[PDB]
Structure formats: structure tokens, C-alpha cells
From a paper:
The pro-oncogenic cellular activities of estrogen receptor alpha (ERα) drive breast cancer pathogenesis. Ligand-dependent transcriptional activities depend on the association of coactivator proteins with ERα to form functional complexes. SERMs and SERDs elicit a structural rearrangement of the ERα LBD to sterically preclude binding of coactivators in the activating function-2 cleft. Activating somatic mutations near ERα helix 12, Y537S and D538G, enable hormone therapy resistance in metastatic ER +breast cancers.
We solved x-ray crystal structures of antiestrogens in complex with Y537S and WT ERα ligand binding domain (LBD) to understand the structural basis of differential transcriptional antagonistic efficacies. LA-5 possesses a 2 S methylpyrrolidine and showed a SERM-like profile with an IC50 of 15.68+0.27 nM and a normalized fluorescence of 1.706 ± 0.09 at 5 μM. LA3-2 and LA5-2 are subsequently referred to as LA-Deg and LA-Stab for Laso degrader and stabilizer respectively. We discovered that addition of a 3R-methyl group on Laso’s pyrrolidine induced both ERα SUMOylation and degrading activities, while addition of a 2S-methyl on the pyrrolidine leads to an accumulation of ERα in the breast cancer cells. LA-Deg induces SUMOylation but to a lesser maximum than fulvestrant and GDC0927 in WT and is further reduced in Y537S, while LA-Stab did not induce SUMOylation with either receptor. Laso, LA-Stab, and LA-Deg showed intermediate efficacy. In these Y537S structures, H12 is slightly more dynamic and the S537-E380 hydrogen bond is no longer observed. Overall, these structures present canonical ERα LBD homodimers with 2–4 monomers in the asymmetric unit.
Numbering used by the authors:
A (entry chain B): 307 to 336, 341 to 416, 421 to 529, 535 to 550
B (entry chain A): 306 to 338, 341 to 417, 420 to 461, 464 to 528, 535 to 545
The structure:
Amino acid sequence: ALSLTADQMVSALLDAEPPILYSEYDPTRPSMMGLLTNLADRELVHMINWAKRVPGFVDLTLHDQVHLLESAWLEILMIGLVWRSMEHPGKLLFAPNLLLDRNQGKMVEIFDMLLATSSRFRMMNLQGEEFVCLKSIILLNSGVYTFLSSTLKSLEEKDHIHRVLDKITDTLIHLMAKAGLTLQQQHQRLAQLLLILSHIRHMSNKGMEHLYSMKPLSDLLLEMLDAHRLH
Amino acid sequence: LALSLTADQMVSALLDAEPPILYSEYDPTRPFSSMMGLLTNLADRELVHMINWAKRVPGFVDLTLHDQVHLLESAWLEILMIGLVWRSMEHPGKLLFAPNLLLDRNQGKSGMVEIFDMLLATSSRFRMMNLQGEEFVCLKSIILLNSGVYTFSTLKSLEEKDHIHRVLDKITDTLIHLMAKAGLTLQQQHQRLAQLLLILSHIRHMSNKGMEHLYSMPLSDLLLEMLD
Ligand SMILES: C[C@@H]1CCCN1CCOc1ccc([C@@H]2c3ccc(O)cc3CC[C@@H]2c2ccccc2)cc1
Ligand SMILES: C[C@@H]1CCCN1CCOc1ccc([C@@H]2c3ccc(O)cc3CC[C@@H]2c2ccccc2)cc1
């Protein structure tokens, strides 16, 4: 796991990818928040499956897996959405049957921020292999500064998370080296990619403000993560 | 000529631009309590020096005043926060708001303690990484340039965004150069670059939480007056 090569890391992440789900409406019939909520809830189940396949994640305690997904889940939905939307300028591909433009989004604020991210991804010509690295970084990084714990186990947990994050950095650099970029270009693109994650955090916080405005997730996460081996 | 700077010239430029460390203004001969009031007054005085600082970050005054305002509107609380975390770095468990205002997390209990704890953790993480002064000024400049650059489509705006990203690239070059100079291997350089940049997502998170607090009880006009 920390023993994986760059190519094995990339292969593992690509293999872990969740499916693209559909909105649940009658397409024969003639609302929006309900559709998005239902989609997101279904997507969360698959997200837990994906998370367990990110190298290193199931090495963590269940408490820490819950903490990381509780921190990162909306970021992860958002980056998935932005990736799906990357070749549909001005629109957001929530699902193959739910492609919305900004007028249909009317918070249109969240909507515009997501569109700009998709644009930035298009500008950078983000690759699939880069995307899955970034999404795994979100999963490992977003909650790693907010463990409210300094037990010896917590120190070990945090060290492991940072070692896995380091392996993903190595993997990104390797992908860029393989694509012919100079060392200078390599560190510049690495930086460009990681700085977008700040914007994605911003978007998640804005979205969370919207959802909390609608009146514990940790219990659901724990239920889905704390699986038995009876299958 | 900002894009023509060497890494060493970029670093000297940034170190030279650093704002002063301000004091809280209260009567120290008087009994202690007024916390938000003290922190607000401090933050407001610190904002004026921030504008001065930003105009000295290579490349920033090449931008339109509209875009300078937009970048500082996005980033100002992040910038106050990374400043605080930096001067708190050698004070485990406390936050050095000012040399005469050093607070532990219990004193922050007077929705604040949540923000206090996140800031303390960032100071811890800086301690663990042994963040250097030259790295810190690079990171703070990156916040200034990056935080608002996804939320500005005119020809001018395309040109502005390209310039911002080119300056950000030069600061990335500069970080890597600092790390190479400190004797780190190429692998260690890229790993440390990534570790430093990923802390910026947490600082963004902290800013949004803090903004929720401040709005709970327009700035661009004040920024414009100060920048113009
Ligand atoms: C999944 C969450 C966790 C438990 C309860 N459930 C509440 C609903 O959460 C959401 C999350 C995202 C959305 C929208 C969405 C849907 C699917 C997806 O792949 C991407 C996104 C991105 C954000 C979007 C949204 C978020 C907040 C406010 C409006 C829209 C809507 C509701
Ligand atoms: C400066 C701004 C812009 C216009 C009005 N003015 C109000 C913002 O006020 C604050 C008040 C407190 C802070 C606290 C602080 C003070 C000084 C400084 O160097 C660092 C910080 C870190 C954040 C901190 C804060 C922010 C929100 C809630 C509680 C504490 C930051 C900004």
C-alpha cells in the first residue's frame, strides 16, 4: 500500500471509480432540489465503496474513516460533478439525464462556482488519471487537520495519512513526467492542481451552509463503513 | 517585470514586504475581561497594513483595481489567519493574536473555540513541518493570488487570469528553489510543495467558518478606498 508503485497506484484508483448514476424522475412526465438530493444520497453509498478501495484508507480506524468522509463527502461529490461537466461548457452534468444550465439553477452562486471549476479543468486539460489522484487527495486531506485527538494512535493515523498523500504526490509527478512535461512544468502543474482544491473546499462550505439551512451524518457513515464480512 | 524576477529576488521582495506585528489596544494596567472587541480592532488595523503589503507582492499592482479588490475581498481573512498561525508557531497551545494578547483555547470560549482549535491545529502542523519564514511568505502570497482567481470573461479578464497564474507559477518555482537550496531531494521537494499547498485548503475552510461567525452579526468599498 505504501509499497505500491506509481503505476499501481493509478491502476488501483481507476479501478475504484464509482459509476455514473441517473436522476430518478419520470422522463415521460413534465422538484430540482429533491432530484439533486436523491441523486446525492444514492451517490454517497457508492462513495463509501470507492473510499474503501483508495489504497491506505481501510488501514485507518473506523472512527477516522468516518471523520475523513464526514469532512470530504460534499467536496468529493462536487469534484465528480465538475469532471462529468468538463466537456459541457456552461452546463452541469448532474447525471446523464439531468444536465442543467445556470438559468435552471435559479443557489445559482454554487452553480456558477462549479461551472468555473469545470472551466478551469478544461483550461488545464485535466486528465482522468490526474482527476482520480485529486479526488483521493481530497478524501485523505480534508479532515486530517481536524482530528480532535492526540492519542498515540492518532499520531500514527495522521502519519500514515500523510505518507499515503505523499505517495499520491509522487504518482501525480510521475504521470506528468510520463506526459513529457519538464521538471519545472511538473511542479507548476502539481501546484496548479492542488490550489484548485482550495476552491473546491470553498464550494463545499458554501453548499453546506445551504444544506444546514434546510435542517447525524456520522452515524450513517459509520453504518455504511462498519460493514461485516458476511458477504 | 514581476515575471522577470529570479527566485532569490522573489524571496527578498516578499520578505521586504512583510507587515509589522501590531499590538492589541487595551489598558494593560486595567483588569482583563471584551474579547471580540479587541480582536476586531486588531484585525481592522491589520487590514490597512495588509493593503500595503499586497501592493508590494510582485505582480499584484499590475492587475486592475477591480481585480485587486476582488482578490483581497476573497483572501483577507485567510491572510490574517495564516499570519496568526505563523506568529503562534512557537507557542504550543496558544494563539499570539498580538505580543500583548496571547490566548489559550479556554480564553477563546468567552462559537469561537471551534475556530481557535482549528487555528491551533494549523500552528501544530506548521511546527511539525518546521515551516520556514521564506516558505511562509510564499504561501501567504499564494493565498492572495489564488483565493479569488476562480470567482472573477472579458478579454481583459482573460489577460488578468493569465497573469495571476503566471505569477503563481513563479512563486511555485521559488518554493521549489528554496527547498532545493535546503538540500531536499527532488522527491522531497515535490512532497513538501504538496504538503504546504494542501494546508491552504484547511486555511480556506477556517476562513469560511470565521466568515459565518462575522456575518452572523460593503467591504469592497473600504478595500477600493484603501487600494485606490
Ligand atoms: C448526501 C447528503 C448527505 C446526507 C444527506 N444528503 C443531503 C443532500 O446533500 C446534497 C449534496 C449535493 C447536492 C448537489 C449535488 C448532487 C449530486 C452530485 O453528484 C453533485 C452535487 C453538487 C452540489 C449540489 C448542491 C449542494 C448544495 C446545495 C445545492 C446543490 C444536493 C444535496
Ligand atoms: C477586518 C474586517 C473587515 C471589515 C471588518 N473587520 C471585521 C473582521 O474582524 C475580525 C475579527 C476577528 C478576527 C480574529 C483575528 C484577529 C486578528 C488577527 O490577526 C487574526 C484573527 C483570526 C481570526 C479571528 C476571528 C475571526 C472570526 C471570529 C473569531 C475570530 C479576524 C477578523
